[PDB]
Amino acid sequence: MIVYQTLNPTTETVERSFDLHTPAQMKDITDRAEHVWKTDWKLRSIAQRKEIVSRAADLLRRDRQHHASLIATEMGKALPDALEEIDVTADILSFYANGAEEFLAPTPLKVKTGQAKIINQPLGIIYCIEPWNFPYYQLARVAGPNLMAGNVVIAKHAPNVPQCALAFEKLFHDAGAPVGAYANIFLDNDQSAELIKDERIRGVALTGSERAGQAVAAQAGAALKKDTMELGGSDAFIVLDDADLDLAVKWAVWGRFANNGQVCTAAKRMIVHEKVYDAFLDGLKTAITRFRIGNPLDRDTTHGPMSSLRAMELALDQTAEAVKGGATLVAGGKRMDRKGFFMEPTILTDVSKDNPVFYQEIFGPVAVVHKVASEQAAIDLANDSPYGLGGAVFSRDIARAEKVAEQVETGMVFINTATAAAPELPFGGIKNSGFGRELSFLGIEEFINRKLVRIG
Amino acid sequence: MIVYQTLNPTTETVERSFDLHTPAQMKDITDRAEHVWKTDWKLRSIAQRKEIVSRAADLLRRDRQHHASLIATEMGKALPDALEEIDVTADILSFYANGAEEFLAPTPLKVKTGQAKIINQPLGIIYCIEPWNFPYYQLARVAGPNLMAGNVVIAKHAPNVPQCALAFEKLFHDAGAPVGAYANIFLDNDQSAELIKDERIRGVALTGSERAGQAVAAQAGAALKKDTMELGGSDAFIVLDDADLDLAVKWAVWGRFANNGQVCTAAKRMIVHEKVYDAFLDGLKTAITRFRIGNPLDRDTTHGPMSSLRAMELALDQTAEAVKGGATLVAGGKRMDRKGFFMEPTILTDVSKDNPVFYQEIFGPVAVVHKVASEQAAIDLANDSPYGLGGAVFSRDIARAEKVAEQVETGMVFINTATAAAPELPFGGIKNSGFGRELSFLGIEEFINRKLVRIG
8 A cells, every 4th residue: 555656745746656666676676786786886996986976976966956856846845955955965975985995994903913904895785764854865874885885775765755766766877886786666565574584685774763663673683684773853952041042042943943843853852941941932932933934946935845744644633632731832733724734833832741742753843842940950851751863952161061961861962053964973863763873984884794804 | 491400411410400580570680770770880980890890800810710610510611611711701801891991982073163072871771692602701792891881781691501690690799790780680581572672671682593593683673772693603714725734723623623613603614625635634533533521620621511412412413414415424423422411523524515514503513624626616615605704714825815814705704713712803793693793892882872972
């Protein structure tokens, strides 16, 4: 019952339909990937691969408008955010293209007897399972390091961004990668599970939901494969009493509502000290009234629709649950009276520890503002989570913000900004947010054979 | 159905029996680990931990003979190899106690704007499942890195080394660790699965068989936790035409027959150039006649019994099967006519690619020797294996051995030495031998939060 198709969320219309690859076609795709890997790709020098991967960055920049428009069309992202996605996607590919030689150099080890080094070698085919919320950047985050490492990639995308998926495969074709180096695949869950069992698949990278992560990580475990899991978060956005209030507000608005809050590192739990709570919340109310919500391709649009009826209905559901559980609906909480999946930017307060959404991931334009009485209480609140992806701390006192950062149980903490992407920066969570680090030098370590060669 | 007991492989006598922990006892073990971590262990300084772990190493060395005798008694390791294991176990604990401050110090990141660093923080309770073949070293390998990083440990050892397991628990007690920092546990396979599900267990380290691995890794994946897997090996031991023949025979004998071949990185597949094959085989046949097989508690015994009747019966089975399959029994191939699980050291030749033992892991004192016509044939034969754990290459030409090393598909390659343990040498395999690296700076990084802290 899975359907790969473009259903435009601004217009509610099915634009394009795509067939699943058959068992035979899946076999052909894996056959091709193995062959090119062993016979061609792993044998090319870093410098030859760099040509290709860097050329792909160049193609994305040149054709940024085209690629950003596919993002906006398939899943509704406002064009300025889609164009930003494409720019960072290009940056990520350049980062690995240019840095791979540094990262993939032999690591000689200091030993008092003879010699030892670690040689970095490719593993094989990496199977990547990627989400719809950042359809280019999630692919680049995996494809850039792995192709530079001499791995090949089979990528199964979310069923609602098939054209983005095809555009990324085409990009690599146009950059000069051989057929089989990077391939798209359209599969049901059964076929995906069978692909994980294939002994030629040497690693599984997943970005997505807990549920998806639980099914796939268990499969990878049973097949005794390396895997990485990048899952949801409910990140704390901590605003201390000595925060630059105007700054915290601006970063909170971007953090929660950029991409309509459909971001795993969205500022989902705003944790604001007593002394600046009223002003923060007033700044928040005001800011969401300035959004230009409409057609993601229109000039002045800041926020498009939700990605799908489902994504919208989940957030509206969670909003109404929270209100029935005792929360105050400060703003929003309703679908807009127009065509397409448009939801009002929403603010909730008084969300107690016993409230049904307290521990939920709200993947939509819905702020949750908690009032805390101290620093310690803010840290305690931030940690009262089954998640641990990112986090933000706001304080004019850098050392205080540092101390707070050390005590919040997550994978990443941003100080005086929101959690925001960059190629240089390692990305990943702890607890139910997953394990492993993508991006930075750490990203390229995940799926390689680090071979010890010892002479004595 | 599991029974935790000492059954002395030299006498064949059950010496002591131990009851399973009750679910209530398991509960208290977990509560106490969590409490101790939160309010004590994670909050101690690196230096305070070092004092404890370094004292643990001190006591190991002080009581060398006591601990080594327990290993001998429970699983049959000859005292010189048991003492060596204790010695290296102490050095592992000393290595991480002394080194952790450097290993765990923050990493500055090269960023375009502002600042970023990675800080290294504990995750919580780490569940370790360890084998009988190195009952102390396997525990230190995980307890050392993890305890120093500020994790606490629950350890389930193989059911035939319970006195070793309890002694290692007692060692950290005597060293001043709080109760709950390191704990032994006696569990059946069902309770073990239930412990993996517990949200408080933040990672699973297993060294064991493929089938143990498959079940536990599936469980850890399904519970959304990081697992670490060190499974089978069937390592190549490559002797080229220009090898120092005496040196290669010496290391082959130790590689295959140390701990009676009950070693995941044992030299299981000896691959010898046709020009030196006869003199190599001659040097091997001769060397094995000089073993002193007997009571492992004696300091002049070189080889004790197998660890169990079943480990012994299987190795003898694989031999009979190999000969029925067309192999030549050069030497050994029988149970010794005395009390205990004593097997003769065995050499097999003419094990062809269609012989049923060709891809099998032989976990016993059974050398398999392959003749090859060339360096490339040797590389090809080494790579004709579902495993990729360790490996060795012997050649006076070091450049040539380095090129062969590069070409063998394995996690580690030793030149002119057999695969052998050292604290500063990273350890792991590829293919069906599992994944991840322990020991060195890499071992301490498996179960930590690599937290990004970023000031924009």
